[PDB]
Design a protein around this ligand. Structure first.
Ligand code: PLX
Lengths: 175, 70
């Protein structure tokens, strides 16, 4: 279905074997499938067709909200309450977006685990590395902030991380 | 229908919060300024506050006093 973008949630081509009846014995699976179609799928399809044609007579749209970019906490005055407020709200929205990105990656990993069957250890390497990278970046970003997290606390964490990285790089390069 | 009938848009709450934050920030800075002004005025005494009374100089009698050396 075109409801969701196939690129964001990829699926393999889903190749399936053709039936290969070795004997002439009629299996019950095909008969049960045919009868299930006959007295399940047809009424359901008719009901869905009726509902869809009723929906088509009344067509209206809803819209995704776009948010403008505002100055971050890094260019905010020490006691400017309004700019601090705007930066905090933008940071919260970005945090929610990051959470949903992690959710998407986790969903892809779980789908890979289920689909690949017994060979999941081999055929789900790429998704595992993607999840590892995303999880590491998310942990570096938002982990250990606490219940009363804020843009300023995350900025302080990032500043401390950059200071440690700069000290390590200065020590190693001059060695 | 619920959103249209019972609620408003996010911009209303956003701007109301901004106005409230501005008002409270000005109130806080005014409180700090008032505390500092009170402290300075009481320590020095050169402002209109904490002006304790002194003896009025209009009560002094400026006239010969039966003795030249006052
Ligand atoms: C098929 C339907 C499925 C869904 C059913 C939903 C049921 C909804 C009923 C529950 C209502 C409670 C939620 C909100 C109530 C108060 C909220 C308040 O803000 O709304 C007020 C309006 O609410 C109603 O006036 C009160 C709801 C009461 C109606 C419930 C029906 C049953 C009540 C029983 C009465 C008893 C009668 C006598 C019995 C013998 C005024 O809104 P306002 O602050 O201006 O908003 C300004 C923004 N504007 C400009 C966009 C409008």
């Amino acid at each position: 279905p075109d409801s969701w973008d196939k690129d964001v949630y990829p699926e393999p081509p889903r190749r399936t074997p053709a039936p290969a009846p070795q004997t002439s014995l009629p299996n019950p699976v095909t008969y049960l499938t045919k009868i299930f179609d006959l007295l399940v799928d047809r009424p359901v399809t008719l009901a869905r067709e009726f509902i869809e044609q009723q929906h088509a007579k009344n067509r209206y749209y809803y819209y995704h909200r776009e948010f403008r970019r505002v100055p971050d906490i890094t260019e905010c005055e020490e006691k400017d309450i309004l700019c601090m407020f705007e930066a905090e709200m933008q940071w919260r929205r970005d945090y929610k977006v990051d959470q949903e990105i992690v959710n998407i990656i986790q969903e892809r990993l779980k789908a890979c685990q289920q689909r690949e069957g017994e060979s999941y250890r081999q055929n789900c390497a790429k998704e595992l590395e993607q999840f590892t990278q995303v999880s590491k970046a998310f942990q570096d970003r938002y982990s250990d902030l606490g219940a009363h997290y804020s843009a300023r606390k995350c900025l302080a964490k990032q500043k401390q991380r950059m200071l440690a990285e700069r000290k390590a790089a200065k020590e190693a390069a001059a060695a | 229908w619920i959103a249209r009938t019972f609620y408003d848009g996010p911009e209303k709450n956003y701007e109301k919060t901004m106005a409230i934050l501005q008002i409270e920030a000005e109130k806080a800075e005014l409180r700090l300024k008032e505390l500092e002004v009170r402290r300075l005025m009481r320590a020095r005494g050169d402002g209109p506050w904490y002006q304790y009374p002194t003896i009025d100089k209009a009560l002094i009698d400026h006239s010969p006093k039966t003795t030249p050396d006052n």
